[PDB]
Amino acid sequence: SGAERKIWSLIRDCSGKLEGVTETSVLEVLLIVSRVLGIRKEDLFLKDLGVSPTEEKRILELVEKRASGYPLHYILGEKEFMGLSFLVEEGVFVPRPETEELVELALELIRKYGIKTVADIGTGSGAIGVSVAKFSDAIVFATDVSSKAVEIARKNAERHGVSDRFFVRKGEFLEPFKEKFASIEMILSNPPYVKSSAHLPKDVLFEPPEALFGGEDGLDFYREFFGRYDTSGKIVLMEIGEDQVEELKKIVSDTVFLKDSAGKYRFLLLNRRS
Amino acid sequence: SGAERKIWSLIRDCSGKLEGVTETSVLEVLLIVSRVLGIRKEDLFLKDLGVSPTEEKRILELVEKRASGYPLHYILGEKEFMGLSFLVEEGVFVPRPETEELVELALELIRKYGIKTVADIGTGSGAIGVSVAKFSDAIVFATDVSSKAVEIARKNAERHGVSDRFFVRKGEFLEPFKEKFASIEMILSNPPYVKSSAHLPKDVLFEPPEALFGGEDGLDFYREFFGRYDTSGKIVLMEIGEDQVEELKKIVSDTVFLKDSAGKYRFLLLNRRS
Numbered sequence: 001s002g003a004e005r006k007i008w009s010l011i012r013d014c015s016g017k018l019e020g021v022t023e024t025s026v027l028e029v030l031l032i033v034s035r036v037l038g039i040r041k042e043d044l045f046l047k048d049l050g051v052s053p054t055e056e057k058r059i060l061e062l063v064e065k066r067a068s069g070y071p072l073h074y075i076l077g078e079k080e081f082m083g084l085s086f087l088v089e090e091g092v093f094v095p096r097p098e099t100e101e102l103v104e105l106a107l108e109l110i111r112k113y114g115i116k117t118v119a120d121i122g123t124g125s126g127a128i129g130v131s132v133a134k135f136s137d138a139i140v141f142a143t144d145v146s147s148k149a150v151e152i153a154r155k156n157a158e159r160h161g162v163s164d165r166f167f168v169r170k171g172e173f174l175e176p177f178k179e180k181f182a183s184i185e186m187i188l189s190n191p192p193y194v195k196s197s198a199h200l201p202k203d204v205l206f207e208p209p210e211a212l213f214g215g216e217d218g219l220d221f222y223r224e225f226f227g228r229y230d231t232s233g234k235i236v237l238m239e240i241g242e243d244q245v246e247e248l249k250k251i252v253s254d255t256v257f258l259k260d261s262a263g264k265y266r267f268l269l270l271n272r273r274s
Numbered sequence: 275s276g277a278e279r280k281i282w283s284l285i286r287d288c289s290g291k292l293e294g295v296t297e298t299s300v301l302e303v304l305l306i307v308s309r310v311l312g313i314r315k316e317d318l319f320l321k322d323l324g325v326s327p328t329e330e331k332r333i334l335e336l337v338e339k340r341a342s343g344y345p346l347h348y349i350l351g352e353k354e355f356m357g358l359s360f361l362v363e364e365g366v367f368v369p370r371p372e373t374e375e376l377v378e379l380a381l382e383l384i385r386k387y388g389i390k391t392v393a394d395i396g397t398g399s400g401a402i403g404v405s406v407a408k409f410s411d412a413i414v415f416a417t418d419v420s421s422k423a424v425e426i427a428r429k430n431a432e433r434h435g436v437s438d439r440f441f442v443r444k445g446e447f448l449e450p451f452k453e454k455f456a457s458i459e460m461i462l463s464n465p466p467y468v469k470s471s472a473h474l475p476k477d478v479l480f481e482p483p484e485a486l487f488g489g490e491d492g493l494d495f496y497r498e499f500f501g502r503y504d505t506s507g508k509i510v511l512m513e514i515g516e517d518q519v520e521e522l523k524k525i526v527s528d529t530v531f532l533k534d535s536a537g538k539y540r541f542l543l544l545n546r547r548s
């Protein structure tokens with residue numbers, strides 16, 4: 001099985017070079033390898049699938065890069081979220097698995113109350129907003145303080161054919177959409193909620209810091225948002241940090257807290273849609 | 275002396291973490307520090323320069339990032355070239371010192387034969403082209419196969435008030451400007467000339483591979499350029515590898531090869547301006 005070995009021997013060596021950086025070293029290597037050969041994952045099994053000395057060196061270089069902690073998805077240029085391919089790159093936060101659960105709850109709520117207008121603060125790549133626009137009929141108003149996030153969220157909205165229902169503007173909270181505030185029925189968000197003093201793992205070291213830190217508390221976004229806006233008549237669903245429930249209850253009243261599929265508190269839900 | 279102890283002790287610890295990654299260890303830390311503090315390098319001495327525990331942590335994180343081999347200029351977001359500050363980021367090649375000497379020779383020939391039209395192939399961040407427009411009267415036609423490079427080159431063009439003399443377009447070689455071909459009196463370029471088999475230093479590992487490699491030989495760009503364009507009545511000045519002179523003589527005849535300030539062969543000059 002001439003070529004069958006070689007590629008799989010290579011796969012294993014690389015996998016070994018990545019452990020200590022990721023528990024899913026084999027998966028990552030498979031992804032890096034198919035990306036460099038220009039084939040879909042599935043074709044990694046094709047008989048007589050070859051790797052030239054150039055493609056081999058490229059793979060070793062990308063593996064050496066990933067070994068430094070650099071994000072796998074920055075290397076891939078994309079991250080799958082809700083089954084959709086979101087373009088990502090340096091300067092943009094990479095969508096996380098827990099945020100998918102926030103979107104599924106948002107969709108269930110949109111179905112339930114026949115909601116038509118949604119907001120996505122801190123849209124980043126557009127993960128939450130674009131997905132909502134993709135699997136519902138709602139229109140979405142998104143914002144981000146990052147110029148780079150706005151341009152990327154636009155591309156991602158266009159990429160999935162929802163540019164007609166997903167609008168993003170640069171700025172903080174909902175300031176760029178003052179004229180639409182009254183009309184917004186649901187406000188979603190996965191804001192920066194990491195404590196200033198929190199230790200950053202090697203890979204998050206490469207993500208935008210403005211996407212992570214929420215002050216000493218890691219609650220600055222919540223305090224300022226709930227302090228400045230009137231949530232009357234609206235529904236607010238936001239992702240939070242495992243240990244912020246008690247402190248959050250003192251920032252916004254009548255709030256409900258739901259947990260992950262991992263059993264950790266992950267979402268705050270305020271329903272003032274009387 | 276008290277507040278000076280804080281910052282200067284930090285700078286020393288940081289430098290320690292960067293040895294083995296760079297010989298200009300302390301210079302880099304000085305650049306990184308003045309960036310998170312929002313001041314010029316020249317003000318690092320000042321009176322009482324303090325570092326909040328937040329700025330301290332950010333500095334340590336950026337040093338931890340540089341420690342991985344991540345390019346210093348990607349962290350800084352800029353590179354000084356010809357005394358001008360050029361924006362750079364992932365996806366764009368960081369201007370190199372040597373290329374400054376190519377530009378000086380370019381301004382030499384422009385302010386001699388009184389040249390008015392210049393081309394810059396593979397402009398990257400625009401260092402060569404933009405600098406030429408900024409220090410002379412000639413206009414420049416820049417190109418690059420990198421969409422990312424095109425946008426940055428353009429930004430740097432506006433950033434230096436030369437958007438009216440610097441025109442960049444996506445595509446390879448001079449195709450995107452074919453109709454201006456006869457108009458161009460001088461063709462400048464710092465193309466990819468690294469052998470596809472060459473070892474990549476830790477930080478080069480983070481730059482665009484299309485900006486580095488020129489085939490097994492390292493001379494692909496040259497071979498294709500000279501075998502496609504008639505250089506009659508034009509001056510061609512390009513950067514080359516230090517070990518490519520002899521093989522390059524077999525690709526283009528009647529060419530002169532100039533040396534670095536470091537004694538290495540770095541440029542090829544074909545003057546056919548009759």
Ligand SMILES: C[S@@+](CC[C@H](N)C(=O)[O-])C[C@H]1O[C@@H](n2cnc3c(N)ncnc32)[C@H](O)[C@@H]1O
Nearest residue numbers: 093095122123124127144145146172173190211
């Ligand atoms: C964790 S990231 C978002 C990632 C993306 N929403 C997701 O779910 O994958 C948080 C984003 O909030 C943005 N951000 C931070 N403060 C903000 C504010 N006050 N208003 C709007 N956006 C903000 C950042 O630029 C960052 O992209």
Ligand SMILES: C[S@@+](CC[C@H](N)C(=O)[O-])C[C@H]1O[C@@H](n2cnc3c(N)ncnc32)[C@H](O)[C@@H]1O
Nearest residue numbers: 367369396397398400401418419420446447485
């Ligand atoms: C070594 S970098 C140039 C660095 C230099 N500091 C500058 O400002 O041009 C080479 C650039 O050439 C571009 N390039 C590579 N092949 C090319 C081609 N066939 N035609 C035009 N540009 C090309 C790349 O996208 C890359 O940005």
Ligand SMILES: NC(=O)CC[C@H](N)C(=O)O
Nearest residue numbers: 096190191192193194212
């Ligand atoms: N929302 C945030 O604070 C961004 C980071 C996110 N909690 C994560 O580590 O996946």
Ligand SMILES: NC(=O)CC[C@H](N)C(=O)O
Nearest residue numbers: 464465466467468485486
């Ligand atoms: N234009 C080039 O290929 C010069 C790049 C330079 N040899 C480097 O690797 O730093």
